[PDB]
Design a protein around this motif. Structure first.
Motif, PDB file in Angstrom:
ATOM      1  N   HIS B 178       0.887  -1.163   0.111  1.00 35.56           N
ATOM      2  CA  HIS B 178      -0.153  -0.018   0.147  1.00 35.56           C
ATOM      3  C   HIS B 178       0.975   1.075  -0.045  1.00 35.56           C
ATOM      4  N   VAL B 179       0.896   1.983  -0.894  1.00 38.03           N
ATOM      5  CA  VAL B 179       1.356   3.207  -1.098  1.00 38.03           C
ATOM      6  C   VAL B 179       0.273   4.415  -1.482  1.00 38.03           C
ATOM      7  N   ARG B 180       0.543   5.505  -0.781  1.00 36.70           N
ATOM      8  CA  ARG B 180      -0.202   6.828  -1.438  1.00 36.70           C
ATOM      9  C   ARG B 180       0.819   7.633  -1.795  1.00 36.70           C
ATOM     10  N   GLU B 181       0.193   8.146  -3.075  1.00 41.88           N
ATOM     11  CA  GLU B 181       1.186   8.868  -3.814  1.00 41.88           C
ATOM     12  C   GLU B 181       0.446  10.310  -3.634  1.00 41.88           C
ATOM     13  N   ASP B 182       1.095  11.534  -3.048  1.00 41.27           N
ATOM     14  CA  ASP B 182       0.714  12.723  -2.653  1.00 41.27           C
ATOM     15  C   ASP B 182       1.060  13.810  -3.996  1.00 41.27           C
ATOM     16  N   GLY B 183       1.686  13.269  -5.039  1.00 42.53           N
ATOM     17  CA  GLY B 183       1.759  14.028  -6.084  1.00 42.53           C
ATOM     18  C   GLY B 183       3.128  13.650  -6.897  1.00 42.53           C
ATOM     19  N   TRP B 184       4.216  14.262  -6.816  1.00 44.86           N
ATOM     20  CA  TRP B 184       5.530  13.845  -7.091  1.00 44.86           C
ATOM     21  C   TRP B 184       6.217  13.248  -6.124  1.00 44.86           C
ATOM     22  N   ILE B 185       5.806  13.057  -5.093  1.00 42.94           N
ATOM     23  CA  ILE B 185       6.488  12.005  -4.206  1.00 42.94           C
ATOM     24  C   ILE B 185       5.428  10.907  -4.173  1.00 42.94           C
ATOM     25  N   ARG B 186       6.277   9.720  -3.414  1.00 42.48           N
ATOM     26  CA  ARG B 186       5.637   8.493  -3.388  1.00 42.48           C
ATOM     27  C   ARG B 186       6.168   8.094  -1.776  1.00 42.48           C
ATOM     28  N   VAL B 187       5.089   7.594  -0.966  1.00 45.18           N
ATOM     29  CA  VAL B 187       5.502   7.006   0.360  1.00 45.18           C
ATOM     30  C   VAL B 187       4.549   6.045   0.445  1.00 45.18           C
ATOM     31  N   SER B 188       5.106   4.784   1.397  1.00 40.67           N
ATOM     32  CA  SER B 188       4.689   3.616   1.618  1.00 40.67           C
ATOM     33  C   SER B 188       3.953   3.716   3.073  1.00 40.67           C
ATOM     34  N   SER B 189       2.539   3.425   2.821  1.00 44.75           N
ATOM     35  CA  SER B 189       1.651   3.506   3.985  1.00 44.75           C
ATOM     36  C   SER B 189       2.093   2.110   4.824  1.00 44.75           C
ATOM     37  N   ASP B 190       1.907   1.219   4.517  1.00 46.71           N
ATOM     38  CA  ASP B 190       2.096  -0.228   5.334  1.00 46.71           C
ATOM     39  C   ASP B 190       2.236  -1.003   4.211  1.00 46.71           C
ATOM     40  N   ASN B 191       3.330  -2.197   4.437  1.00 40.18           N
ATOM     41  CA  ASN B 191       3.042  -3.407   3.463  1.00 40.18           C
ATOM     42  C   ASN B 191       2.680  -4.486   4.569  1.00 40.18           C
ATOM     43  N   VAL B 192       1.350  -4.510   4.423  1.00 42.77           N
ATOM     44  CA  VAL B 192       0.552  -5.582   5.267  1.00 42.77           C
ATOM     45  C   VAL B 192       0.259  -6.891   4.208  1.00 42.77           C
ATOM     46  N   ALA B 193       0.210  -8.036   5.001  1.00 43.65           N
ATOM     47  CA  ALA B 193      -0.170  -9.152   4.393  1.00 43.65           C
ATOM     48  C   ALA B 193      -1.308  -9.099   4.317  1.00 43.65           C
ATOM     49  N   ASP B 194      -1.979 -10.095   3.135  1.00 40.00           N
ATOM     50  CA  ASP B 194      -3.499 -10.308   2.652  1.00 40.00           C
ATOM     51  C   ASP B 194      -4.068 -11.106   3.818  1.00 40.00           C
ATOM     52  N   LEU B 195      -3.209 -12.359   4.292  1.00 47.80           N
ATOM     53  CA  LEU B 195      -3.736 -12.952   5.571  1.00 47.80           C
ATOM     54  C   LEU B 195      -3.639 -12.454   6.762  1.00 47.80           C
ATOM     55  N   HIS B 196      -2.966 -11.277   7.190  1.00 45.70           N
ATOM     56  CA  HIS B 196      -3.176 -10.440   8.415  1.00 45.70           C
ATOM     57  C   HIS B 196      -4.590  -9.430   8.183  1.00 45.70           C
ATOM     58  N   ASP B 197      -4.893  -8.670   7.225  1.00 42.73           N
ATOM     59  CA  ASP B 197      -6.021  -7.918   7.101  1.00 42.73           C
ATOM     60  C   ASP B 197      -7.456  -8.485   7.488  1.00 42.73           C
TER      61      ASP B 197
END
Lengths: 246, 201, 249, 205, 196, 219, 233, 234, 213
Positions: B178-197
């Protein structure tokens, strides 16, 4: 090809001959002035040498490379128009502008065209049996931003942005009179920018509205080349303003 | 309309959602991997399927745009990344195909989202996805998705979507990156497993 | 060896001219009168026929009036040699444009394609430029009637009335004196052109062997390109000749 | 002038000969295969504007080939005063088609023309890969060329009037649209004469 | 190939053209907000229709070509001339390895007759006309215009022709298509027309 | 389709052919000449598919022209064979042309039959088109394998007449082409075996079955 | 006449000896490698206020973490820089990580001398370029400053100056600049040396500075940053 | 087998404004054999001197008078080697045209083609122009035709022209002796007389070649036929 | 995967386990081109430095072409980049081959197992179409999941504590290698002769031949 005979060879003076021969040919004449506004950039050439029998509608000495990029050219001699020489730079630049717009979805900037002029002059230098064009172009245009720009190039291929510049028949003389005329109001009001181009051209030699042709660009909208009838009205109003300040 | 790199637009950000997967969908060849690659900090993309093909076209897209952006000192748009990828890939075609990248940047005419696939489709929509299983996913998501969702508000949206998706989906050895992109930056929200969520939500 | 022989005529001069174009410029002046005048219903060209003998085949339409397209025609000032290769090339270009666009080609569009080639010779390559300067006459949809002139490096200028060749200054000034920017019709326009040719040329009564005049006239929405025959030309000569007679008195 | 395939874009030409003239009828339709929705667009070109060649079937290959040939025709026309004959164009067309490989241009030509400005008549039809045939009788051409020739040989008195002919040839067209399905509706007759082009509009279903 | 849906009804008060936003790969729609009429110039349009991908492809090249003439001539290019040049460009691409059949839809301003629409078949055939449909749909819409023709037809009457079609399209056609972009074009600008 | 033969006799070479040129088994045209006259020295008979044969003769004719003029030797049939074999290979063995090249060198008159194979084939006396063997088979039969020129000329004409009778594809006039190396006597009517019935009676009509609403001449 | 291709009895080529002189004609550029980062300083030397000072550039990016200052004919250098941009991203497609200062510099230098005035391909030089480039950046290996010559001799430096002051400045750098001088002090050292070749005093519209420092990408210094170094020289 | 070629400026304009090379090429053709072409309007006749100044030359197949194709021929004056490549080249164009049209190339069309070649030789460097003037004849499309192409790459139309030595006198003798609306027989007679007015003196039938051109074709007559003609002329 | 047609088969199965700085690569000791195995000797494995050990298997024609190439790419990389071969060498080579083999389908899985020239251990897996990833389990061949699982269960220790309650040591990986090879013979019927396991360290190359059990 078979022709590889030297036309350019390097000097111990630390120059390329052709480039310098070209540079003096823009010292000696063909006044081209450009000012950059705040909505619109206007470039003007003086001389198409309308002797009152020539056509004014179809003659172009300002050519639209793109619909948001335009150039006005100069370099003169006894062979007075080097329109031919320009016409090559104009055609290759025209495809390149369009080409850049197909690949990259930003509208092509003047900064791209200026690097492209610096490489065309140079490429002609390195290739055997080939010689740099004499042109100097005032590249006008709009970026991705929509910001008006005026950039000027020299026959070597070095570019700078400038708010207002004049070249031809004393580049520095026309520019230093014009320097007073460049004020915050002048750049803001679009109508005042059209007058600023015409007002500079008038310093070298005065009068003529047919000799003067100027092309205007507003936003990313297409080039509009103004009627000479529009120029004549404008020179008459400029001449009275000179008496008012002074 | 399909998975493997998928994006949906908001004002505040875009959501970048992707899979970590190896090979075809029948088995993995590794377990540890992240196929997620950062070609430019403009956004993230990464696919799967025909592996050489996605990496090749994005790498060309990345080369052209990055040189132009970096030298010129003019930021390249959604429209530009998409035009490079499109022009390149049809030419290269007949040398395997399967590129599924989602292009984002903020432009003069506001935020623009174009979806780039290897057919030569170039699409803007509510949510688009190119690759495989998100085709089912765009149906539930559209309902739970506003035109403009906030970033925080959007993070909660991803967590619910996914948590039901793992129950329906039978592909294992994945992570939701999971990444949210706020424009010409890219930050990684979380890299959560499909089994966890599924447990969380 | 090779550079030494190369006279370096391809070099730029400090002043900003090309030596070759300037030497070509003189080649045009030696050679005969070619003038084009604009009129308001058609446009006409008058060129000097330099092939006078009493034994002439006339295997060509004319040796100076060339119909480049089925909507353009041109006349020549310069050297016949350059004119022949060039005239053929002008035909492929005019004709391809006609295929794509399907409308008459601008006179301006026609000079520019050639210009690249002219320029190429002069700047580099050490190849001579073409020894002819061409007056193209046409009608294109966009501007209406037009006349274009090309020079030995492809330098172009749109002209209502212009003349190059022998006694070029005399012909253009005279024509400037009576007519200034499109004051006359097609009928009167032929009578001025022959009059100018008359003064410039050594024979001061002319015949149809001395002059050849070509008209390009827009009729029923389509451009007609016709080289006028000797018979039509004599009528035009008698009209100017008579006008000159009154002048004296 | 020339095209790809035979009825895959419609177009059918039949000629009857008159002492003075040649009459040619063709439908004036257009659009691929069966559909002949639109009706404004030409197939016959002029190669002196008193000589014509027509190639008949798909419009794409019709306009691309016709124009590309015209450039070469034109250069020859301007160069030598005597503009190229009937005979010269049939042979030019044979050589130009055979030359291609990709998207093979197989026209079924109808040349409709008296030679030059002179008052000597010609009519001819060619095969798909269109080797030239000299003839001065009567010509029908299209996918089913042999059907139009048979019938064109049977109809005339010997040489009816030009007037009488426009009416015959128009009726020849009208029966034929019913025999095929790749064309139908709207009919144009070009009576091709030695000094004039008479264009006549025949009655359509 | 023809199994799109276009209609263009030419009059000289207006020209009404509509198209679906419905470029669908897989089972869902990649475009459903993108407009399907592309801007070649500010008074000129090309509508590319065929396969979904091939449509976007045709336009970008063409866009460069229209603008370029505008620059070259130093006036707006001739409508007749552009339409023929767009036909030569689609036939040239046809030769090239990827075979592309493309239905182009020319809107131009001509010196006559007024507002004009020049019509393009999937036989890669340029044709002057009044009353046209593009796509599999061309076949029914051309026929409806044929019962009631007007080529100077006012805007109110244009809505009536449209509405008899829209209810039919919803139940009898395989395009129920509730997502449509409809525009009516006067000679100066693009105006948006009601969608049923 | 076509029925062509050329012969080597005790004189020079006699070519015999039926008129009709067919696009397949159906006539594209019922007029002109199947056996074609080229330059003065070279005559060529044509057989099999029409499209492949006419064009092959024409292309080789340019090549042969260049070679004749420069060399200033009269054309040799072995020479002619090699040129067709090389050209047809260039094309890649597309189409069917059984071609009959026949020219007089300074020695004897020499006749060759080149099928589409791209072979170096030396006959004795040959007939082409149709099936190569089927036409060739006749030569062994009627010719004793050399007889006087006049007797041989009636003989070819008679054998070719039989193939016209047996195979209705060939139609109209039978042409005989007597070919030397500067004399090309093209005798249209050696034998006319068949001709049509007069098209005297019309199928014309007055306008009342189709009418005209225009008669104008555009400018 | 004699050609230019010839070797002289000195034992050097004519074209090349001229090209070094071409380097000497232009404006001075200083590239200092510090172990805190690599700073590149160049003089604008503007003569008119109508110019926009941002767009006078003589620092152009080879890479996104390598900056380059160039000297001599401004135009002649620009072509070499155009070819350099294509190689750095190209390097990213193949290796899957960004180009080093060393790799880029050796590849451009091969092109620098190739010259055959007659009977040589038009896709190859007739004359060498008179430009000296200073490639300064910090890359995977660490801060590196490499110097490139128009003679196509590349060498690693810590402090190099090229332009009109090239010999004078280079000697003067060796003196002040050492590896016991920090990055901000390198910026002060360059500013003093800059003034003799300049026509006026140092200003924030008469220098352009850009530093590439570890863990960071290339930053073009803003007006405030230029002004802080101007205060104390 | 290593060369790029040289292209250099002696083929660019002088300061006089005329081309240095063309004047010299015209000098080469003036030094040549005299050659007359007369269009009868009943056929085209071309006459040249057979001789090369030793008459130990076989010439029963080697001629100065060569057919290009079925009814178009060239006769030349000037340089022998340069003519040989032009004869060979001209044929090649004729046959190319022959493939497409079926008719042999017109004299009007052929000259432009040849003219391009003459042009390359002038305009590019490291070459020099051909020094051969061509009389091109044909009878085609219902009219007999005579063209001139000089060495520069100009083509001029004449109905009676003379070349070589005393090109000036030939043009005046043609003006005088030959009148319009006379027949073919008269034309043939006048050409041998123009050659008498253009290098004078003794003639044998191995010092002259005469060739007649019709739609039947161009042919250069046998030595005997030419002999009968000699006796007629003064 | 795919059944040998495009290029000759040469069987063989590769297992790879990464620990932290010791990585075992095993493939069978055989050269095949034909259904029978020519000779036990092989040159499938080639070492370029002690830093990197590459294994190309399957089709023998593929195996020799790429492995030599990898030695060339190493040489080029030390010169220009000024980083000694290792991780960097590995990423670069997998792109160029995987373009080469994948239109005419890929029948070799090259596995670069090394340490970076800056350090950190990588084990790299291509499918046959370009991907590079770092892994702690790898299975590669037609049976590209048959070994993968043992490394997933035993190395990762996801629902497992009886191979190690943590993560394997060097002593532990080598013990496990002999065991795994004995097991493979049972399931996969495309082997003859011997199985060779090479253990690649930054400080020790190890080789061991192990008979097919």
């Amino acid at each position: 090809m078979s022709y590889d005979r030297a036309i350019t060879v390097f000097s111990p003076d630390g120059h390329l001959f052709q480039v310098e021969y070209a540079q003096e040919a823009v010292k000696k004449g063909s006044t081209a002035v450009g000012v950059r506004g705040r909505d619109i950039v206007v470039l003007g050439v003086e001389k198409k040498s309308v002797a009152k029998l020539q056509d004014e509608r179809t003659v172009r000495k300002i050519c639209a490379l793109d619909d948001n990029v335009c150039m006005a050219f100069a370099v003169v001699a006894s062979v007075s128009g080097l329109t031919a020489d320009a016409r090559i730079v104009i055609n290759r630049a025209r495809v390149e502008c369009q080409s850049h717009r197909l690949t990259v979805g930003d509208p092509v900037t003047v900064e791209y065209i200026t690097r492209y002029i610096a490489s065309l002059k140079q490429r002609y230098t390195q290739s055997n049996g080939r010689r740099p064009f004499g042109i100097s172009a005032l590249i006008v245009g709009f970026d991705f931003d929509g910001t008006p720009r005026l950039y000027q190039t020299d026959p070597s291929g070095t570019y700078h942005a400038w708010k207002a510049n004049a070249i031809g028949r004393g580049a520095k003389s026309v520019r230093e009179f014009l320097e007073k005329n460049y004020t915050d109001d002048a750049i803001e009001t679009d109508d005042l920018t059209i007058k600023l181009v015409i007002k500079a051209l008038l310093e070298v030699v005065q009068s003529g509205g047919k000799n003067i042709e100027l092309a205007v660009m507003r936003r990313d909208q297409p080039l509009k080349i103004l009627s000479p009838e529009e120029i004549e009205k404008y020179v008459a109003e400029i001449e009275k303003e000179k008496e008012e300040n002074e | 309309t399909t998975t493997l790199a998928f994006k949906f637009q908001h004002g505040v950000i875009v959501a970048a959602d992707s899979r970590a997967t190896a090979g075809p969908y029948i088995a993995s060849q590794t377990v540890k991997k992240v196929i997620e690659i950062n070609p430019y900090l403009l956004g993230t993309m990464a696919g799967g399927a025909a592996d050489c093909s996605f990496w090749e076209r994005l790498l060309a897209r990345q080369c052209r745009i990055y040189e132009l952006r970096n030298k010129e000192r003019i930021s390249v748009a959604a429209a530009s990344k998409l035009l490079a990828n499109m022009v390149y890939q049809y030419k290269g075609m007949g040398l395997s195909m399967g590129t599924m990248i989602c292009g984002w940047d903020k432009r003069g005419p506001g935020l623009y989202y174009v979806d780039s696939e290897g057919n030569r489709i170039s699409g803007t929509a509510f949510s688009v996805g190119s690759g495989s299983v998100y085709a089912f996913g765009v149906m539930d998501r559209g309902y739970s998705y506003d035109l403009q969702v906030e970033e925080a508000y959007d993070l909660a949206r991803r967590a619910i979507y996914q948590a039901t998706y793992r129950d329906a989906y039978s592909g294992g050895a994945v992570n939701l990156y999971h990444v949210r992109e706020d424009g010409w930056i890219r930050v990684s929200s979380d890299n959560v497993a499909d089994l966890h969520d599924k447990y969380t939500s | 060896m090779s550079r030494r022989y190369d006279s370096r005529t391809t070099i730029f001069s400090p002043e900003g001219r090309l030596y070759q174009v300037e030497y070509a410029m003189e080649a045009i002046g030696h050679a005969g009168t070619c003038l084009g005048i604009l009129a308001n219903d058609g446009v006409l060209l008058a060129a000097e026929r330099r092939n006078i003998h009493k034994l002439l085949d006339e295997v060509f339409f004319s040796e100076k009036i060339y119909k480049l397209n089925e909507d353009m025609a041109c006349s020549v000032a310069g050297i016949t040699s350059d004119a022949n290769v060039l005239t053929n090339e002008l035909r492929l270009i005019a004709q391809r444009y006609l295929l794509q666009y399907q409308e008459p080609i601008p006179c301006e569009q026609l000079v520019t394609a050639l210009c690249d080639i002219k320029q190429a010779y002069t700047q580099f390559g050490g190849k001579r430029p073409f020894g002819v300067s061409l007056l193209y006459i046409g009608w294109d949809k966009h501007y209406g009637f037009q006349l274009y002139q090309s020079d030995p490096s492809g330098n172009y200028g749109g002209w209502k009335a212009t003349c190059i060749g022998n006694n070029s200054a005399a012909a253009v000034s005279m024509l400037k004196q009576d007519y200034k920017e499109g004051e006359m019709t097609l009928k009167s326009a032929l009578a001025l052109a022959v009059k100018v040719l008359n003064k410039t040329m050594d024979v001061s009564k002319l015949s149809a062997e001395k002059v050849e005049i070509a008209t390009l006239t827009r009729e029923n929405g389509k451009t007609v390109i016709r080289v006028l025959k000797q018979k039509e030309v004599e009528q035009l000569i008698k009209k100017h000749e008579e006008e000159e007679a009154k002048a004296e008195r | 002038m020339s095209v790809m395939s035979y009825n895959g874009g419609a177009v059918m030409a039949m000629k009857g000969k008159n002492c003075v003239a040649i009459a040619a009828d063709r439908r004036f339709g257009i659009q691929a295969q069966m559909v002949t929705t639109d009706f404004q667009k030409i197939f016959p070109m002029g190669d002196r504007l008193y000589i014509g060649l027509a190639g008949l079937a798909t419009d794409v290959q019709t306009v691309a080939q016709r124009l590309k040939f015209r450039l070469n025709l034109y250069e020859l026309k301007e160069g030598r005063q005597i503009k190229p004959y009937t005979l010269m164009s049939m042979v030019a067309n044979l050589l130009y088609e055979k030359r291609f490989g990709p998207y093979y241009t197989e026209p079924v030509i109808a040349g409709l023309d008296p030679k030059t400005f002179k008052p000597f008549i010609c009519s001819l039809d060619l095969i798909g890969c269109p080797m030239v045939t000299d003839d001065f009788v009567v010509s029908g051409t299209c996918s089913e060329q042999m059907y139009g020739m048979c019938e064109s040989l049977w109809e005339p008195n010997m040489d009816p009037e030009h007037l009488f002919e426009t009416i015959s040839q128009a009726m020849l067209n009208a029966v034929d649209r019913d025999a095929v399905s790749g064309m139908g509706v709207i009919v144009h007759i070009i009576e091709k004469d030695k000094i004039t082009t008479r264009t006549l509009k025949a009655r359509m279903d | 190939m023809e199994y799109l849906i276009g209609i263009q009804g030419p009059d000289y008060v207006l020209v009404a053209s509509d198209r679906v936003a419905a470029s669908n790969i897989v089972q869902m729609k990649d475009d459903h907000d993108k407009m399907f009429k592309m801007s070649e110039k500010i008074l000129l349009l090309c509508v590319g229709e065929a396969g979904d991908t091939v449509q976007f492809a045709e336009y970008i090249q063409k866009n460069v070509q229209l603008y370029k003439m505008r620059n070259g001539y130093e006036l707006s290019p001739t409508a007749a001339a552009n339409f023929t040049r767009r036909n030569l460009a689609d036939c040239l691409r046809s030769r090239t390895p990827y075979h592309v059949n493309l239905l182009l839809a020319g809107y131009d301003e001509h010196e006559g007759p007024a507002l004009y629409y020049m019509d393009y078949l999937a036989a890669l055939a340029k044709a002057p006309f009044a009353a046209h449909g593009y796509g599999a749909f061309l076949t029914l819409s051309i026929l409806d215009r044929y019962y009631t023709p007007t080529i100077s037809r006012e805007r109110a009457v244009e809505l009536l022709r449209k509405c008899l079609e829209e209810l039919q399209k919803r139940f009898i056609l395989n395009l129920p298509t509730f997502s449509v972009r409809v525009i009516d074009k006067d000679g100066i600008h693009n105006l948006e027309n009601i969608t049923f | 389709t076509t029925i062509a033969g050329v012969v080597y006799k005790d004189g020079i070479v006699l070519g015999a052919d039926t008129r009709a040129t067919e696009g397949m088994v159906v006539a594209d045209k019922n007029c002109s000449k199947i056996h074609f006259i080229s330059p003065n020295i070279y005559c060529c008979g044509a057989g099999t598919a029409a499209d492949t044969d006419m064009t092959t003769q024409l292309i080789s004719s340019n090549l042969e022209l260049h070679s004749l003029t420069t060399g200033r030797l009269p054309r040799v049939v072995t020479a002619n064979r090699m040129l067709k074999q090389m050209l047809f290979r260039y094309q890649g063995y597309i189409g069917a042309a059984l071609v009959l090249g026949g020219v007089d060198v300074t020695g004897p008159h020499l006749y060759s039959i080149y099928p589409h194979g791209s072979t170096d084939k030396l006959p004795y006396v040959t007939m082409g088109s149709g099936s190569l063997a089927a036409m060739a088979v006749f030569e062994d039969k009627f010719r004793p394998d050399m007889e006087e020129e006049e007797a041989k000329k009636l003989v070819s004409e008679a054998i070719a007449a039989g193939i016209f009778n047996d195979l209705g594809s060939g139609s109209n006039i039978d042409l005989c082409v007597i070919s030397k190396s500067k004399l090309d006597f093209l005798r249209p009517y050696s034998v006319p075996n068949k001709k049509g019935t007069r098209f005297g009676r019309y199928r014309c009509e007055k306008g009342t079955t189709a009418v005209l609403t225009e008669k104008v001449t555009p400018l | 006449d004699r050609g230019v291709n010839t070797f002289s009895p000195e034992g050097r080529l004519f074209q090349v000896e001229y090209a070094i002189e071409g380097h000497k004609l232009g404006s001075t550029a200083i590239g200092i490698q510090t172990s805190e980062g690599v700073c590149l300083a160049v003089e604008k030397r503007i003569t008119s206020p109508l110019m926009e000072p941002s767009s006078i550039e003589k620092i152009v990016e080879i890479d996104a973490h390598i900056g380059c200052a160039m000297s001599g004919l401004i135009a002649d250098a620009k072509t070499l820089i155009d070819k350099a941009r294509v190689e750095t991203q190209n390097h990213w497609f193949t290796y899957n990580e960004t180009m080093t200062v060393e790799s880029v510099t050796q590849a451009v230098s091969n092109l620098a001398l190739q010259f055959g005035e007659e009977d040589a391909d038009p896709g190859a030089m007739s004359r060498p370029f008179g430009v000296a480039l200073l490639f300064g950046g910090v890359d995977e290996k660490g801060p590196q400053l490499f110097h490139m010559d128009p003679s196509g001799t590349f060498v690693q430096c810590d402090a190099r100056a090229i332009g009109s002051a090239s010999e004078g400045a280079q000697s003067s750098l060796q003196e002040v600049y050492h590896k016991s001088t920090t990055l901000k002090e390198a910026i002060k050292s360059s500013l003093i040396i800059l003034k003799q070749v300049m026509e006026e005093k140092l200003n924030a519209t008469n220098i352009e500075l850009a530093t590439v420092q570890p863990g960071q990408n290339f930053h073009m210094f803003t007006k405030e940053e230029l002004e802080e170094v101007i205060k104390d020289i | 087998m290593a060369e790029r070629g040289y292209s250099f400026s002696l083929t660019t304009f002088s300061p006089s404004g005329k081309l240095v090379q063309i004047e010299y090429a015209l000098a080469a053709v003036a030094g040549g054999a005299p050659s007359v072409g007369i269009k009868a309007a009943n056929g085209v006749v071309l006459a040249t001197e057979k001789k090369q100044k030793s008459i130990l030359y076989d010439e029963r197949s080697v001629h100065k008078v060569e057919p290009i194709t079925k009814h178009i021929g060239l006769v030349y004056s000037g340089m022998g080697p340069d003519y040989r490549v032009l004869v060979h080249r001209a044929r090649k164009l004729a046959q190319q045209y022959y493939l497409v049209y079926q008719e042999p190339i017109p004299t009007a069309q052929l000259v432009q083609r040849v003219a391009s070649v003459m042009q390359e030789y002038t305009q590019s460097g490291g070459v020099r122009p051909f020094g051969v003037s061509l009389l091109i004849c044909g009878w085609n499309e219902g009219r007999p035709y005579l063209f001139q192409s000089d060495p520069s790459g100009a083509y001029f139309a004449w109905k009676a022209t003379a070349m070589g030595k005393n090109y000036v006198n030939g043009k005046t003798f043609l003006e005088k002796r030959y009148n319009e609306d006379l027949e073919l027989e008269d034309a043939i007679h006048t050409a041998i007389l123009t050659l008498k007015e253009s290098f004078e003196g003794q003639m044998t039938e191995d010092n002259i070649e005469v060739g007649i051109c019709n739609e039947a074709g161009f042919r250069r007559l046998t030595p005997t036929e030419v002999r009968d003609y000699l006796a007629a002329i003064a | 995967r795919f059944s040998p047609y495009a290029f000759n088969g040469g069987t063989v199965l590769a297992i790879a386990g990464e620990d932290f700085s010791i990585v075992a690569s095993d493939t069978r000791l055989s050269e095949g081109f034909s259904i029978h195995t020519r000779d036990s000797p092989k040159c499938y494995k080639l070492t370029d430095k002690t830093v990197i050990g590459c294994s190309g298997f399957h089709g023998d024609c593929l195996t020799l072409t790429k492995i030599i190439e990898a030695r060339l790419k190493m040489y080029k990389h030390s010169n220009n980049k000024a980083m000694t071969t290792g991780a960097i060498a590995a990423m670069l080579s997998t792109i160029l081959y995987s373009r080469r083999f994948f239109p005419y389908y890929v029948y070799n899985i090259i596995e670069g197992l090394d340490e970076e020239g800056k350090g950190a251990v990588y084990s790299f897996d291509p499918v046959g179409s370009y991907q590079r990833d770092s892994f702690k389990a790898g299975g590669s061949a037609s049976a590209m999941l048959q070994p993968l699982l043992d490394n997933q269960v035993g190395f990762k220790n996801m629902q497992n504590v009886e191979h190690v309650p943590l993560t394997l040591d060097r002593a532990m990986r080598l013990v496990k290698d002999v065991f795994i090879s004995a097991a493979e013979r049972d399931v996969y019927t495309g082997d003859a002769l011997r199985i060779c396991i090479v253990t690649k360290e930054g400080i020790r190359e190890e080789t061991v031949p192990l008979r097919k059990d």
